Amino acid sequence: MPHAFKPGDLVFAKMKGYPHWPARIDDIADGAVKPPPNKYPIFFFGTHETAFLGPKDLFPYDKSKDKYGKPNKRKGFNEGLWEIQNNPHASYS
Numbered sequence: 022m023p024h025a026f027k028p029g030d031l032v033f034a035k036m037k038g039y040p041h042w043p044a045r046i047d048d049i050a051d052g053a054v055k056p057p058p059n060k061y062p063i064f065f066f067g068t069h070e071t072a073f074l075g076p077k078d079l080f081p082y083d084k085s086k087d088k089y090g091k092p093n094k095r096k097g098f099n100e101g102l103w104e105i106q107n108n109p110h111a112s113y114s
Contacts, residue, residue: 026046026061026076026079027046028046028047028048029045029046029048029110030045030046030081031043031044031045031081031082031083031105031109032044032045032046032063032079032080032081032082032085033079033080033082033085033086033089033090034063034065034072034074034078034079034080035074035078035079035080036072036074036078039095040089040093040095040098041080041085041088041089042065042066042067042068042098042101043065043066043067043082043090043098043101043102043104043105044063044064044065044066044101044105045063045064045066045105045109045110046061046062046063046064046079047061047062047063047064047071048062049062056073057073059075060073060074060075061073061074061075061076061079063079064113065097065101066097066100066101066102066104066105066109066113067096067097067098067099067100067101067102067104068096068097068101069097069113082105090102090105090106
């Protein structure tokens with residue numbers, strides 16, 4: 022049965038006006054800005070952007086890839102698919 026989300030979890034993350042997007046839950050580094058309460062720091066593969074999202078916008082990768090893991094015209098999306106599949110836990114700084 023499911024746990025709460027934890028850093029390292031792989032997801033598709035949903036933001037207004039974009040398709041469900043390959044992403045991961047990030048750690049917060051020592052010294053870095055913390056998210057608001059009830060929000061997780063989300064790192065979007067491909068774009069390499071961070072936003073703060075709550076669970077309603079986070080779909081577990083394994084369950085969702087057959088629906089959401091298809092090529093997309095959007096900038097950075099296909100790069101994003103390669104990353105989540107091939108090196109989802111790398112440094113992309």
